[PDB]
Design an enzyme around this catalytic site. Structure first.
Site, mmCIF file in Angstrom:
data_model
loop_
_atom_site.group_PDB
_atom_site.id
_atom_site.type_symbol
_atom_site.label_atom_id
_atom_site.label_comp_id
_atom_site.label_asym_id
_atom_site.label_seq_id
_atom_site.Cartn_x
_atom_site.Cartn_y
_atom_site.Cartn_z
ATOM 1 N N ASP A 99 0.778 -1.221 0.000
ATOM 2 C CA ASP A 99 0.000 0.000 0.000
ATOM 3 C C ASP A 99 0.810 1.271 0.000
ATOM 4 O O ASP A 99 0.233 2.312 -0.263
ATOM 5 C CB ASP A 99 -0.919 0.031 1.240
ATOM 6 C CG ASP A 99 -0.196 -0.215 2.556
ATOM 7 O OD1 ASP A 99 1.007 -0.491 2.610
ATOM 8 O OD2 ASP A 99 -0.813 -0.123 3.603
ATOM 9 N N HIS A 100 2.111 1.242 0.233
ATOM 10 C CA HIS A 100 2.891 2.457 0.449
ATOM 11 C C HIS A 100 3.660 2.972 -0.737
ATOM 12 O O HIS A 100 4.228 4.069 -0.670
ATOM 13 C CB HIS A 100 3.897 2.267 1.597
ATOM 14 C CG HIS A 100 3.291 2.422 3.003
ATOM 15 N ND1 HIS A 100 2.356 1.717 3.644
ATOM 16 C CD2 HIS A 100 3.637 3.434 3.866
ATOM 17 C CE1 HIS A 100 2.123 2.247 4.818
ATOM 18 N NE2 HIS A 100 2.910 3.282 4.944
ATOM 19 N N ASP A 164 3.902 -0.744 11.622
ATOM 20 C CA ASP A 164 3.357 0.535 11.234
ATOM 21 C C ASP A 164 2.806 1.157 12.513
ATOM 22 O O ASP A 164 2.086 0.489 13.276
ATOM 23 C CB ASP A 164 2.207 0.376 10.254
ATOM 24 C CG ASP A 164 1.776 1.664 9.623
ATOM 25 O OD1 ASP A 164 2.415 2.048 8.652
ATOM 26 O OD2 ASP A 164 0.809 2.297 10.067
ATOM 27 N N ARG A 446 -1.344 12.516 10.844
ATOM 28 C CA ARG A 446 -0.172 13.346 11.065
ATOM 29 C C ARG A 446 -0.147 14.452 10.025
ATOM 30 O O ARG A 446 -0.598 14.267 8.889
ATOM 31 C CB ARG A 446 1.149 12.637 10.880
ATOM 32 C CG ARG A 446 1.270 11.490 11.762
ATOM 33 C CD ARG A 446 2.597 10.801 11.646
ATOM 34 N NE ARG A 446 2.451 9.809 12.688
ATOM 35 C CZ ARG A 446 2.690 8.506 12.610
ATOM 36 N NH1 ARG A 446 3.096 7.852 11.493
ATOM 37 N NH2 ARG A 446 2.421 7.892 13.770
ATOM 38 N N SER A 641 6.166 7.830 13.235
ATOM 39 C CA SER A 641 6.253 6.578 12.530
ATOM 40 C C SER A 641 7.198 5.596 13.178
ATOM 41 O O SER A 641 8.253 6.023 13.670
ATOM 42 C CB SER A 641 6.700 6.899 11.139
ATOM 43 O OG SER A 641 7.426 5.772 10.624
ATOM 44 N N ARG A 643 9.190 3.336 11.678
ATOM 45 C CA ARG A 643 10.261 2.921 10.761
ATOM 46 C C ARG A 643 11.590 2.642 11.463
ATOM 47 O O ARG A 643 12.256 3.532 11.989
ATOM 48 C CB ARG A 643 10.386 4.022 9.678
ATOM 49 C CG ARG A 643 10.708 5.427 10.187
ATOM 50 C CD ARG A 643 10.653 6.392 9.043
ATOM 51 N NE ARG A 643 9.261 6.588 8.686
ATOM 52 C CZ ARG A 643 8.817 7.755 8.246
ATOM 53 N NH1 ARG A 643 9.700 8.711 7.992
ATOM 54 N NH2 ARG A 643 7.504 7.958 8.008
HETATM 55 C C1 MIC Z 1 4.534 5.653 6.486
HETATM 56 C C2 MIC Z 1 3.948 5.405 7.842
HETATM 57 O O1 MIC Z 1 2.818 4.614 7.546
HETATM 58 C C3 MIC Z 1 3.577 6.765 8.477
HETATM 59 O O2 MIC Z 1 2.376 7.042 8.540
HETATM 60 O O3 MIC Z 1 4.454 7.572 8.934
HETATM 61 C C4 MIC Z 1 4.832 4.670 8.894
HETATM 62 C C5 MIC Z 1 5.592 3.438 8.527
HETATM 63 C C6 MIC Z 1 6.721 3.693 7.629
HETATM 64 O O4 MIC Z 1 7.540 4.596 7.822
HETATM 65 O O5 MIC Z 1 6.790 3.014 6.586
HETATM 66 C C7 MIC Z 1 4.336 4.520 10.378
HETATM 67 O O6 MIC Z 1 3.379 5.165 10.832
HETATM 68 O O7 MIC Z 1 4.888 3.737 11.153
HETATM 69 S S1 SF4 Z 2 -1.236 6.782 8.322
HETATM 70 FE FE1 SF4 Z 2 0.385 5.367 7.512
HETATM 71 S S2 SF4 Z 2 -0.735 3.421 6.883
HETATM 72 FE FE2 SF4 Z 2 -2.273 5.108 7.171
HETATM 73 S S3 SF4 Z 2 -2.816 5.818 5.052
HETATM 74 FE FE3 SF4 Z 2 -1.261 7.194 6.020
HETATM 75 S S4 SF4 Z 2 0.763 6.388 5.467
HETATM 76 FE FE4 SF4 Z 2 -0.768 4.780 5.014
#
Ligand code: MIC
Ligand code: SF4
Length: 753
Positions: A99-100, A164, A446, A641, A643
């Site tokens: 999905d990313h 995530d 966010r 996040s 990560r």
């Molecule tokens: C992208 C992400 O979904 C985000 O919303 O910051 C991440 C995970 C990632 O960095 O791939 C998260 O929330 O953990």
């Molecule tokens: S908050 Fe993270 S998992 Fe959710 S839609 Fe955004 S990037 Fe994707």
């Protein structure tokens, strides 16, 4: 007992509520006090309920999760670490969700076709590694990880971990769903106990019922403004009270989802009839029937103690919009128009974006269509640009079928692929130049600097999908849907009626196209190929074991000022291309952090050459020359996040310790996992004693012990030395990860070689 499968895809994996009950009962005989709902589900999953030390906020629990979910930006590095372990198959039900990596540009089908070509190498690696190690694979286009989990995998009482930080979304179906880094997911896939610091429990009592324009999203926008981004650290938020039955199951998932923005370990709602209804409409009536037989274990005990209690009367709650910059800057929609004006925030909305895992449900899409049909009935269309992200293929096929996607296209919206897209900056945005100050409003979560479009001057406000639709039609923040009038085509002023829509389809959900790929759990003769010249994937070389010595005369790479999110430490957007390649993604290390020396991002003094330059380049120069370095940070370092690249990248480029006033939970665990020392000031005013030019010695690693502070000698250039003490939260399991060089190195030592 009952033999009810965990999902439609794992017909032989049964729900173990018998196990949960047995464990809850061993624990409550030891504690002799009422248990909250999160204590029932978490302690019901203990590896050793008879012997586990249990003190909220103090002990580390050894837990057995039921399943693991990964999304494709974090699955690559979790699977490359699983491939180093050498273990042949995952030990629990595990899925990968793609999905990313789908960029929004042309809309829907066109963007999905392009992503499949561009990301071929990566989707290939994940599908092949999935087939080999027994991990289920949801193909690109299937949907956003958390919507697929709510629709197929979350159930009352599950303990699920996901790579995530918005994995708490699953709390809307009564389960404990916790965000972790890839190495924590490797523990569970490898069959070893997962450790979690015993949480505190914040109770939020909901009273009354939602009305009119107020929606489930307003509850968590209000709670974030109250608790702030650091108020939930180390705690689970447990919603309870008569107002709960007023909220739909997807509404409850929205509220649990955004509890990630206050730093909460997770959030949960008690099992009730709205969840039952959702389980039955998603083909899981047998699971709702079994949860009815174990219902006592799926609600809190009478008289349980919360460490903090907040009460919110849903009948008095009014629409909110939060931001710009932080998700806890909360404003009523009624006053954001005047605060914007005062603060110099752009009043005109360039883009309105609905969706993301937070707000992409069937009910969310129907409420937005309900606002949009009114505008259409007066010959209007959106003044702002308008995008719609369906959370899953099932939701895309059902809103298409029930007519909501066409209403949204007729007011001027573009339907994007079922993917994160603009939510993590996978958006080819061309309407503003970089550095151009502008305002976008989203129904996301966010809204940190440069996350949606890499432009630091985009002011992003997060609100509910029906308010994004109302504001996109008006084109300005100075519009309050509840009070103000639009002028139709015909010249008449008209007011928007509060949206009303069904929570779930009257008919069944249309599942859409086939997107799941089950592992052959027969055959599995896959060769995972990672080309040695690939720019996107690279096999890991193990980090160095600890040398047995203290860390002397450490250079400070950067002393960071203020907020330092994991998007400041390891940016996403374009860098997602390299999430399976550690050396290539390490070129974004700390490029967003503000250096206290000059107040600039990505400009630090090289101590040897005395030139100011990029942080990655300076860290590689120090590593080339054998200079070991440290990062000094402020409060809540590593916010956001999950990560693990934020911890892997400083280890790779030669870092040894990160010393801050405090850490966000997941990042501190990821630092320990990768063999770094996350340390906090025993006195936070000592942050002011350290200057960028100082060298530091950390002593006492030889008798490193739980609860004993480490001594830090600050060596000032002029010859003055000062000793300060640094605290750490390591237990003996974790000191072993450090001595081995990483948790993966320690695990491979236990394999008798
Ligand atoms: C992208 C992400 O979904 C985000 O919303 O910051 C991440 C995970 C990632 O960095 O791939 C998260 O929330 O953990
Ligand atoms: S908050 Fe993270 S998992 Fe959710 S839609 Fe955004 S990037 Fe994707």
């Amino acid at each position: 007992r009952a033999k009810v499968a965990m999902s439609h895809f794992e017909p032989h994996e049964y729900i173990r509520y018998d196990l949960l009950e047995k464990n809850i009962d061993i624990v409550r005989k030891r504690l002799n006090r009422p248990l909250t709902l999160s204590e029932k589900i978490v302690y019901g999953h203990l590896d050793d309920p008879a012997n586990q030390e249990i003190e909220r906020g103090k002990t580390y629990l050894r837990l057995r999760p039921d399943r693991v979910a990964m999304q494709d930006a974090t699955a690559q590095m979790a699977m490359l670490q699983f491939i180093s372990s050498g273990l042949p198959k995952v030990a629990v039900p595990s899925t990968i969700h793609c999905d990313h990596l789908i960029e929004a540009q042309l809309g829907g089908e066109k963007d999905l076709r392009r992503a499949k070509d561009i990301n071929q190498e990566v989707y290939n690696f994940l599908a092949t590694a999935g087939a080999k190690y027994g991990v289920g694979f949801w193909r690109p286009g299937s949907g956003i990880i958390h919507q697929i989990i709510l629709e197929n995998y979350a159930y009352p009482g599950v303990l699920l971990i996901g790579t995530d930080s918005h994995t708490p979304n699953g709390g809307g179906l009564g389960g404990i769903c916790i965000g972790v880094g890839g190495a924590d997911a490797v523990d569970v896939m490898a069959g070893i106990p997962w450790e979690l610091k015993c949480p505190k429990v914040i109770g939020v009592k909901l009273t009354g019922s939602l009305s009119g324009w107020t929606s489930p999203k307003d509850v968590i926008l209000k709670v974030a403004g109250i608790l702030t981004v650091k108020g939930g650290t180390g705690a689970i938020v447990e919603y309870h009270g008569p107002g709960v039955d007023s909220i739909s199951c997807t509404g409850m998932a929205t509220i649990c989802n955004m509890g990630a923005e206050i730093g909460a370990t997770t959030s949960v709602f008690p099992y009730n009839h709205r969840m039952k209804k959702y389980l039955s409409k998603t083909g899981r009536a047998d699971i709702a029937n079994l949860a009815d037989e174990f219902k006592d274990h799926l609600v809190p005990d009478s008289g349980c103690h919360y460490d903090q209690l907040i009460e919110i009367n849903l009948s008095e709650l009014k629409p909110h919009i939060n931001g710009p910059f932080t998700p806890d800057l909360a404003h009523p929609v009624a006053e954001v128009g005047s605060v914007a004006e005062k603060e110099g925030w752009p009043l005109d909305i360039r883009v309105g974006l609905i969706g993301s895992c937070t707000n992409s449900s069937y009910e969310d899409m129907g409420r937005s269509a309900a606002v949009a049909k009114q505008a259409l009935a007066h010959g209007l269309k959106c003044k702002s640009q308008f995008t719609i992200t369906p959370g899953s293929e099932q939701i895309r096929a059902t809103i298409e079928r029930d007519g909501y996607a066409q209403v949204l296209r007729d007011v001027g919206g573009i339907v994007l692929a079922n993917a994160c897209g603009p939510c993590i900056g996978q958006w080819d945005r061309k309407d503003i130049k970089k550095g151009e100050k502008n305002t976008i409003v989203t129904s996301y979560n966010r809204n940190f600097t440069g996350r949606n479009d890499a432009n630091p001057e985009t002011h992003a406000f997060v609100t509910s999908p029906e308010i994004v639709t109302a504001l996109a039609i008006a084109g300005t923040l100075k519009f309050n849907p509840e009070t103000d009038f639009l002028t139709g085509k015909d010249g008449k002023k008209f007011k928007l009626e509060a949206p009303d829509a069904d929570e779930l389809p009257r008919a069944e959900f249309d599942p859409g196209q086939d997107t799941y790929q089950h592992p052959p759990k027969d055959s599995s003769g896959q060769r995972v190929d990672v080309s040695p010249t690939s720019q996107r994937l690279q096999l890991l070389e193990p980090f160095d074991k600890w040398d047995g010595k203290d860390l002397e005369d450490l250079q400070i790479l950067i002393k960071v000022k203020g907020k330092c999110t994991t998007d400041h430490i390891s940016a996403a957007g374009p860098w997602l291309k390299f999430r399976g390649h550690l050396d290539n993604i390490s070129n974004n290390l700390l490029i967003g952090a503000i250096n206290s020396e000059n107040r600039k991002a990505n400009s630090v003094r090289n101590a040897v050459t005395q030139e100011f330059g990029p942080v990655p380049d300076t860290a590689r120069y120090y590593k080339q020359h054998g200079i070991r370095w440290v990062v000094i940070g402020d409060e809540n370092y590593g916010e956001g996040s999950s990560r693990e690249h934020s911890a892997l990248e400083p280890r790779f480029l030669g870092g040894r310790a990160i010393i801050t006033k405090s850490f966000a939970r997941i990042h501190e665990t990821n630092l320990k996992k990768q063999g770094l020392l996350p340390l906090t000031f025993a006195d936070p005013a000592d942050y002011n004693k350290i200057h960028p030019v100082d060298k530091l010695t950390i002593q006492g690693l030889k008798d490193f012990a739980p609860g004993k502070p480490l001594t830090c000698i600050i060596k000032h250039p002029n010859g003055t030395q000062e000793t300060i003490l640094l605290n750490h939260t390591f237990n003996e399991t974790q000191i072993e990860w450090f001595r081995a060089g990483s948790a993966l190195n320690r695990m491979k030592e236990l394999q008798q070689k």
